[PDB]
Design a protein around this ligand. Sequence first.
Ligand SMILES: N#Cc1ccc(O)c(-c2cc(C(=O)O)ccn2)c1
Ligand SMILES: [Mn+2]
Ligand SMILES: [Zn+2]
Length: 351
Amino acid sequence: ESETLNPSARIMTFYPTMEEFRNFSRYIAYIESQGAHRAGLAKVVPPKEWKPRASYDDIDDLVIPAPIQQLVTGQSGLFTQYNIQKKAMTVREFRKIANSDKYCTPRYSEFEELERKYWKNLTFNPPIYGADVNGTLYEKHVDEWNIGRLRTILDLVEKESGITIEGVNTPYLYFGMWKTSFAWHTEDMDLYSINYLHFGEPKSWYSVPPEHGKRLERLAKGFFPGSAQSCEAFLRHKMTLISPLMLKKYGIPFDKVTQEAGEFMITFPYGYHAGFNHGFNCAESTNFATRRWIEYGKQAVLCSCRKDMVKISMDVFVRKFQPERYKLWKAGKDNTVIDHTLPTPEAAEFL
Ligand SMILES: N#Cc1ccc(O)c(-c2cc(C(=O)O)ccn2)c1
Ligand SMILES: [Mn+2]
Ligand SMILES: [Zn+2]
């Protein structure tokens, strides 16, 4: 039973062997079989034997075409992040700024100390995030967990229509510095995501279980009624930051995890997450899908107030994987209800 596995919906950590690590979709289905998805977020530590690139010593020349300065406004654990686009710059130039005294990591003993400082100084001295950089740091030959070519069914989007959506079915790189942030969100079309930390200081994550996502939404709508009235899904703007103390105070279940260089994070459909970087680092990510995602995709509530928001046609997926329901679905009469505790069909061999 779905409900009997990971009943506390806690973030799980997995240490696959090299044999397990080789088939990406298999291991995703496997960790789902262990209830990992119920947390919304999971950590996967790859075998020590494994490395996606021999050396990162060459990248100081790589261009960050649109660095973003992150202005944050708010109080009492509620904040809204405004992006200001800076002029292009190099990893060398970025690293110099990031390690500079003005911008570098404050010192501290335990994580909770660094965490407290993040939520205390969030609004002061705005950092720069080298974000949404198109590209990959994977060497052309690495066949395990290659973010450039995961070969999941998300590939049906490009295959059928030729459409690429930057960062979604293509890779993004993220160059961080201390106190740079990602706001509370689910992925576009409530897909999965994979995030790999190539190098640098840690990246910390908060997550809310999918079975409690709607609860976080009610709370957010209550605290940002203006934004809620203007948009059916304003959290998709990725501007909204909420401190873990505010989540506790209003009884939203959540969990924390800190990601180290060379570690993977997997986010699951309708898994709300947010977080921040500890210092200079580099992360790579993209979205992907499983058969389980399709229903999430069919029902995802999208941003209504922008023309350039990401919308994937679900049609090809329903035809190919839910043929019984296609007619009904197209007639707007498909009332399937989602069970967030259930694992993906592909795990039939591990169920
Ligand atoms: N803006 C934005 C945005 C859109 C989609 C995403 O998955 C993330 C995101 C970014 C990070 C990160 O900046 O490290 C971690 C997790 N999620 C951020
Ligand atoms: Mn994300
Ligand atoms: Zn919107």
